[PDB]
């Protein structure tokens, strides 16, 4: 459900193979109470795409893949109607939950 693809992209900010350790964005996406800050955090996480691209390119392993545009609108087609924070947490926490998965990137 377009969760693994974005989780593997968020995993690029925590893994030691990318020696930048973007942990603030993980806290922002996990600690989201309403609509605006969750989108702000996911934008901040996605903004570091060239960082990861040039880090993997300059290190040797294949560059990371950006989340596909096909499920980008899928993110906003559901979170819009999660007016209640209680059910919004089920996805806000899960976004960072999948950010710590194994996600083998470079050999």
């Amino acid at each position: 459900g377009w969760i693994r693809n974005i989780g593997r992209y968020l995993s690029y900010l925590v893994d030691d193979t990318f020696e930048e350790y973007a942990y603030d964005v993980v806290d922002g996406i996990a600690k989201a109470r309403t609509q605006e800050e969750l989108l702000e955090g996911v934008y901040k996480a996605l903004r570091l795409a060239p960082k990861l691209k040039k880090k993997a390119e300059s290190k040797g392993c294949p560059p990371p893949r950006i989340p596909s545009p096909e499920d980008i609108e899928a993110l906003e087609e559901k979170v819009e109607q999660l007016s209640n924070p209680k059910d919004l947490r089920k996805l806000a926490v899960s976004l960072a939950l999948w950010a710590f998965a194994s996600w083998n990137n470079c050999p």
Binding site: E19, E20, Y21, Y23, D24, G28, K31, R33, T34, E37
Partner: protein, 336 residues
């Protein structure tokens, strides 16, 4: 005497009471939850905060700093000169004075006479069992309820990442297999209008808790085991310790951060007797509540002396428009 202070401080860009270690990447600052109205049910919001342990430690540091210059500074613990809070930890019985003399942790009067840090800030002697309740109590440092309501949850945390340029003597930036420590880490800085409250019980300094009174002439004469001049000097040093309190010396990482401080407004009351605790600045309506408290206390027969900075208070009760912290502590020491 007994003096209570409560007010607001404008503090920004501070990494005070961080959680992660020096070698740990992404050094994290402490956060505390606060319950606010937000024109609906009581909602809990997690916001950066400053623990009272740091405030107590820095009050102790200021107290020893202002007491060393006093002629009675020799009556101090060796650890106090090192700015170490380990006052008679677990596994020892005898302690060391400032000049190196030994002191026995058996009689509370001797401990509070030969040592001054254990008197003002209390102490614990687990081996013997001797204890002393601290006369200085520091609250947490929380942003005001109105401010956190207005910001509506805007993080208020800046995670600034920085590293070093640790390089080999040959000029090559080595990896972990070379001997350099070129590691990447981050520090969290907070901002906002915080509220502070600290209470001092200097009226009981030099008084052992076991025998607060002596009753020699069938009168409530306090059991002042030390000289009255020494007690006055200790009280003056404790009051002057508030000068670096609201100046930028109440946190860690001062070398690389040095947080920007400015007192907006505050109130302080002292009457050399029992006094109700002032309402903390975390609440937006603390001014009227404190005005009511100090008006009822004065009406109850208390000689409450009130110094207020940058607040109208009640503009009818006896309040002195103090201009700064130094003037406030001067007024406090003028009534000793």
């Amino acid at each position: 005497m007994y003096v209570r202070i409560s007010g607001r401080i404008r503090l920004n860009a501070h990494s005070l009471n961080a959680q992660g270690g020096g070698g740990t990447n992404y050094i994290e600052i402490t956060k505390t939850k606060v319950t606010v109205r937000t024109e609906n049910g009581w909602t809990v919001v997690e916001v950066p905060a400053i623990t009272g342990n740091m405030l107590k430690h820095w009050h102790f540091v200021g107290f020893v700093d202002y007491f060393k210059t006093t002629p009675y500074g020799v009556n101090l613990t060796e650890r106090a000169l090192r700015y170490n809070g380990t006052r008679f930890g677990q596994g020892e019985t005898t302690a060391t004075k400032a000049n190196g003399a030994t002191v026995q942790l058996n009689d509370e009067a001797t401990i509070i006479k030969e040592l001054a840090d254990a008197d003002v800030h209390g102490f614990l002697a687990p081996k013997t069992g001797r204890r002393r309740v601290s006369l200085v109590k520091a609250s947490f440092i929380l942003p005001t309820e109105d401010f956190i309501k207005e910001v509506e949850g805007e993080r208020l945390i800046t995670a600034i990442k920085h590293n070093r340029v640790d390089v080999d003597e040959k000029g090559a930036i080595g990896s972990s297999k070379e001997g350099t420590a070129q590691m990447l880490f981050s520090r969290e800085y907070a901002t906002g209008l915080y509220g502070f409250s600290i209470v001092l019980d200097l009226g009981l300094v030099g008084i052992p808790q076991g025998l607060p009174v002596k009753f020699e002439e069938n009168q409530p004469r306090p059991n002042i085991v030390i000289d009255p001049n020494e007690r006055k000097a200790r009280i003056e040093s404790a009051l002057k310790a508030l000068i670096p309190m609201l100046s930028g010396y109440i946190g860690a990482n001062l070398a690389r951060s040095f947080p920007v401080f400015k007192v907006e407004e505050l109130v302080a009351i002292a009457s050399e007797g029992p006094i109700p605790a002032l309402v903390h600045g975390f609440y937006e309506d603390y001014i009227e509540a404190n005005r009511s408290i100090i008006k009822n206390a004065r009406a109850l027969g208390f000689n409450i002396e009130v110094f207020t900075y940058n607040v109208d208070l009640g503009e009818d009760i006896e309040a002195t428009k103090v201009s700064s912290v130094e003037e406030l502590v001067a007024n406090l020491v003028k009534m000793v």
